[PDB]
Curated annotation (Swiss-Prot):
Keywords: Calcium, Disulfide bond, Glycoprotein, Heme, Hydrogen peroxide, Iron, Lignin degradation, Manganese, Metal-binding, Oxidoreductase, Peroxidase, Secreted, Signal. It comes from Phanerodontia chrysosporium (White-rot fungus). This is Manganese peroxidase 1. The active site is at 46 (proton acceptor). The record marks 42 as: Transition state stabilizer.
Length: 357
């Protein structure tokens, strides 16, 4: 079909997603893999994973827009602390782009956001999820203090995910920061390149922790290998769950397998997201609108590298059967600050709408 703007696409039903992408980019992302992009990507996961095979449909409808349609319920669960900002940012689009379901909006926005992160895959995007659902129940969202057994169980119960798929999905922590885990600091990044969809998170979680970016006593957090911060350039934070996954026998080799393997990581993330984005639905009942997902920013193609102040002697390895790759180290004796802003600065306040969540 040919859309009003003259864009030729796969199906007429995909046309409305074009101005929605444009509005999202102009209004909240500005084509950056920044704060607002990060929060929406997190929302795609919190929306989708709230489903349970064993509990039945009454527990939650998966990728169903429930966070937007019931903004006062799930966003106030403690495991959803901080999700309100992303919900409040997407609700005005739901009201404006009113031929697109809340559920479709959430998944598509996540694909758009990810496209701004150099190295990310161009996600599959199927459309047609209904605009009516129920509020999910509490306890369906994995938490950083959770054990690996509990985490893997939750993912298997939600949609049959394998441990490979689970770790694949955690490539999103390559473009992720923490605002709620520590009450004193904000935007503590999970890797030294939170604006780049690279494999640094996999490497950096395997280094010996040497301090904390904030307090040493936060639930769900463990020591960080790069805790130095200054001004708004908060130090790296390490989640207990990421650390646990990197060292548990079930997932240690998969974790290490993404180190310095960009295309493998990206391809695996795309495959897992294909499954996550249609939880609560039969994919044979959704139309393919992948062609209206923006083309992602390409990676530079550079190998993963040890950040300054770290090196191979700092590795805590847990995969007996696979050789840890030979990597270079960025020159310098002391840790480099991790920039708060995509353009290297420390001042870049994102657009935030007030709302019901
Ligand atoms: C065992 C699984 C996981 C756990 C326990 C976990 C936990 C967390 C935690 C605690 C935060 C910090 C939130 C804050 O305090 O502001 C976070 C942020 C993030 N998560 Fe995860 N997560 C998991 C899986 C996922 C998955 C599967 C994705 C998406 C595909 C996702 C994407 C992100 C993003 C993008 C952020 C950054 C948000 C921002 O910087 O504003 N996470 N995660
Ligand atoms: C999906 O449901 C939401 C919530 O009922 C709808 O949102 C309303 O949209 C209209 C414009 O169409 C606004 O005037 C209302 O303020 C919105 N309500 C709320 C609670 O925000 C939305 O229109 C529906 N979308 C589709 C595709 O049917
Ligand atoms: C980042 O900054 C550190 C100093 O904090 C250097 O050691 C490194 O080489 C890079 O310039
Ligand atoms: Ca949901
Ligand atoms: Ca990164
Ligand atoms: Ca955030
Ligand atoms: Na709130």
């Amino acid at each position: 079909a040919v859309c009003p703007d003259g864009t030729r696409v796969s199906h007429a039903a995909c046309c409305a997603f074009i101005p929605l992408a444009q509005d999202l980019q102009e209004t909240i992302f500005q084509n950056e893999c920044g704060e607002d992009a990060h929060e929406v990507i997190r929302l795609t996961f919190h929306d989708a994973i709230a489903i349970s095979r064993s509990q039945g449909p009454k527990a939650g409808g998966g990728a169903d827009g429930s966070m937007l349609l019931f903004p006062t319920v799930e966003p106030n669960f403690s495991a959803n602390n901080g999700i309100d900002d992303s919900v409040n940012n997407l609700i005005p689009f739901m009201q404006k782009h009113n031929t697109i379901s809340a559920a479709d909006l959430v998944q598509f926005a996540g694909a758009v956001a990810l496209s701004n992160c150099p190295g990310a895959p161009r996600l599959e995007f199927l459309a047609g999820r209904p605009n009516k659902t129920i509020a999910a129940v509490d306890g369906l969202i994995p938490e950083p203090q959770d054990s690996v057994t509990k985490i893997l169980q939750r993912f298997e119960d939600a949609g049959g995910f394998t441990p490979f798929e689970v770790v694949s999905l955690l490539a999103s922590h390559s473009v992720a920061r923490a605002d709620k885990v520590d009450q004193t600091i904000d935007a503590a990044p999970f890797d030294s390149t939170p604006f780049t969809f690279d494999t640094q998170v996999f490497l950096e979680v395997l280094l010996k922790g040497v301090g904390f970016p904030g307090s040493a006593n936060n639930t769900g957090e463990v020591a960080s290998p790069l805790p130095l911060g200054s001004g708004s350039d908060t130090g790296e934070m390490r989640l207990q769950s990421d650390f646990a996954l990197a060292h548990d026998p079930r997932t240690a080799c998969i974790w290490q397998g993404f180190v310095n393997e960009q295309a493998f990581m990206a391809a695996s993330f795309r495959a897992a997201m294909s499954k996550l984005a249609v939880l609560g639905h039969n994919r044979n009942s959704l139309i393919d609108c992948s062609d209206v997902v923006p083309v992602p920013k390409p990676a530079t193609g550079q190998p993963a590298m040890f950040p300054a102040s770290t090196g191979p002697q700092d590795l805590e390895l847990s995969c007996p059967s696979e050789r840890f790759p030979t990597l270079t180290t960025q020159p310098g004796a002391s840790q480099s600050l991790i920039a708060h802003c995509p353009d290297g600065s420390m001042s870049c306040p994102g657009v935030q709408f007030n709302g019901p969540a």
